[PDB]
Structure 1
Amino acid sequence: DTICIGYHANNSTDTVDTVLEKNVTVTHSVNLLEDSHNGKLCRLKGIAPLQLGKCNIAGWLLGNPECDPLLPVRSWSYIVETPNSENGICYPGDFIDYEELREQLSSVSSFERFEIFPKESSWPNHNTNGVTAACSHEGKSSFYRNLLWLTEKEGSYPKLKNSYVNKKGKEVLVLWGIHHPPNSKEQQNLYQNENAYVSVVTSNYNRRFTPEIAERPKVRDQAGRMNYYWTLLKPGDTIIFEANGNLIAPMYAFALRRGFGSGIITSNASMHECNTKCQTPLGAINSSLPYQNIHPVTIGECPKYVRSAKLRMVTGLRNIPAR
């Protein structure tokens, strides 16, 4: 009669590392590192992301004719740009504080695109048909959907002054531009007044713009330049535009609604009808593990990103079949 004390063993080939020894075959263990994703862009808790596609934030907010499909979108869970998001500003120039505008849009859950200055009724004494081949559509010269190029009307450019009172009960993002002719002749032909200026003011914003005329290299086949600006108009405040030339006026503005958890990512993955709580530029993740080595960029509730290739915690004991 014999009684022996022993321990479990099995077929398992699971291995783990320890401080003293590497690749210790063990009976049981648990992986703590998520390395799987579905390779798709999904909805985040039911809400679809905004796919800018061939456009970028600038093209989208200004209304680049190449981004018309985006015009109707009002809500999204996160913003997606692609390696091919090349359609931003179409008329050469500088977009002032663009990175900050992008940061601002990162916490916007939704907005309403509305006419702040109706194309007809806002500028009775100015031409508004200004167009450019730099912003063409259907092989025909066009212009930003949200802005209006004001020009001389019948050899005259009256000093304009238009106001908008924010009665939306929300922040209103207002965008506009300042055009800069390459020479004095053009300035005269387009705006009459040789020494023009543009003034934009609110309760907390105050800026004046002066045309800077000089010959410049052609970009997108234009020597002219357009600088883009923006500001946030607080609920109840009033924005005033005053000019006697060079103003690329606002036509459409955006009443913003703030949210949490959104962000802008860059991905070449496609949108699918899938839902997730965690999205990476490479694909969505469905996991309860504490870590993931899939991607450092995440939207939602995800595992902590680490550069590890393996993180396995032994639970059972050293496996010794003793064969």
Structure 2
Amino acid sequence: DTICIGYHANNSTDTVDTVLEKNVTVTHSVNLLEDSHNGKLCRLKGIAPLQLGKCNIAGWLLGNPECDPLLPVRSWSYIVETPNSENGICYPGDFIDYEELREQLSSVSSFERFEIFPKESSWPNHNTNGVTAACSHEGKSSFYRNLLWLTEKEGSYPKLKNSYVNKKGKEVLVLWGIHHPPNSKEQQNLYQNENAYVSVVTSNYNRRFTPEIAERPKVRDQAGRMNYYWTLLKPGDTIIFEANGNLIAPMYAFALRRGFGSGIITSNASMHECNTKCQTPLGAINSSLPYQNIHPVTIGECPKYVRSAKLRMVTGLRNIPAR
């Protein structure tokens, strides 16, 4: 009669590494590294992301004619740009503090696009039909949907002064532009006043813009330039535009609602009717593991990104079938 003391063994082929030995076959183990996802863009807790498609933040907010499909979208869980998001500004120029504007939008959960200055009744003494081949739609010269190009009327460009009181109970993002003719002749024909200027002020914003005329290389067939600016009008505050030329006035503005967990990501993956708690540019993740080696960019609640190819923790013991 004999009684022996021994340990469990099996067919398991799992391997793990230790400090003293690599690839040690064990009986039971647990993976802590998530490496799977569905190469799809999903809703984040039921809320769909804003897909800018061929447009970028600039195109979307200024109302580039090629981004009309975005006009009605009022809320999203995250923002998505693609490698092919070229349609930004259509009229050449500089978008001042553009990166900071993007950062601002990354914490916006939703907004209401509204007419801050109705086209029909805001500029009684100025022409508002200004258009450009640089911003064409349906093969016809057009303009930004949220801005209005003001020009002289009947050989005159009166000094304008319009105001808007923020009674939306929320921060209102106001955008506008300043046009810069390539020569004085154009400055004269468009705005009449040779030494024009634009002024924009609120309780905490104060800037003056002077046209800077000069011949410039053509971009999108334009020697002219248009610089874009923006500011956040506090609830209850008033913004005043005053000018005698060169102002590309605001028509539509945005009452913003703040949220958490949003952000902008770049992806070439497609949107599908799936839901997730964790989204990456490559696809969505559904996991409880502590780490993942899929992508460093994450939206939601995700495992920690790490460069590891493998992270397997041994639970059972050294497997020795002894066959």
TM-score range, shorter-chain basis? over 0.9
Superposition deviation, residue 269 in structure 1: 0.0
Superposition deviation, residue 150 in structure 1: 0.0
Superposition deviation, residue 149 in structure 1: 0.1
- Give the Cα separation in 2 of the matches to 1:45 and 1:137: 36
Name the count of aligned residue pairs: 323
Is 2:261 aligned against 1:261? yes
- Give the Cα separation in 2 of the matches to 1:67 and 1:34: 37
Q: Residue deviations 1:94-144, cap 9 Å, x none?
A: 000000000000000000000000001000000000000000000000000
Q: Residue deviations 1:168-198, cap 9 Å, x none?
A: 0000000000000000000000000000000
- Give the Cα separation in 1 of the matches to 2:306 and 2:42: 23
- Give the Cα separation in 2 of the matches to 1:107 and 1:98: 15
Is 2:84 aligned against 1:84? yes
Can you give the 5+ residue segments of structure 2 that lack an aligned partner in the other structure? none
Cross-structure match for 1:98: 98
Superposition deviation, residue 226 in structure 1: 0.1
Q: Residue deviations 1:282-316, cap 9 Å, x none?
A: 00000000000000000000000000000000000
TM-score by length of 2: 1.00
Superposition deviation, residue 213 in structure 1: 0.1
Superposition deviation, residue 249 in structure 1: 0.0
Q: Residue deviations 1:35-54, cap 9 Å, x none?
A: 00011000000000000000
What secondary structure does 2:119 align onto?
A: coil
Can you give the 5+ residue segments of structure 1 that lack an aligned partner in the other structure? none
- Give the Cα separation in 1 of the matches to 2:37 and 2:217: 47
Tell me how large the CA RMSD over aligned residues is.
0.1
Superposition deviation, residue 252 in structure 1: 0.1
- Give the Cα separation in 2 of the matches to 1:300 and 1:147: 34
- Give the Cα separation in 1 of the matches to 2:228 and 2:154: 27
What secondary structure does 1:121 align onto?
A: helix
- Give the Cα separation in 2 of the matches to 1:127 and 1:301: 51
Cross-structure match for 1:110: 110
Superposition deviation, residue 79 in structure 1: 0.1
> What is the percentage of aligned positions where both structures have the same residue?
100
- Give the Cα separation in 2 of the matches to 1:194 and 1:155: 13
Superposition deviation, residue 81 in structure 1: 0.0
Superposition deviation, residue 246 in structure 1: 0.1
- Give the Cα separation in 2 of the matches to 1:120 and 1:209: 25
Cross-structure match for 1:304: 304
Superposition deviation, residue 233 in structure 1: 0.1
What secondary structure does 2:255 align onto?
A: strand
Superposition deviation, residue 11 in structure 1: 0.2
Q: Residue deviations 1:77-99, cap 9 Å, x none?
A: 00000000000000000000000
Runs of 4+ in 1 over 2 A off after TM superposition: none
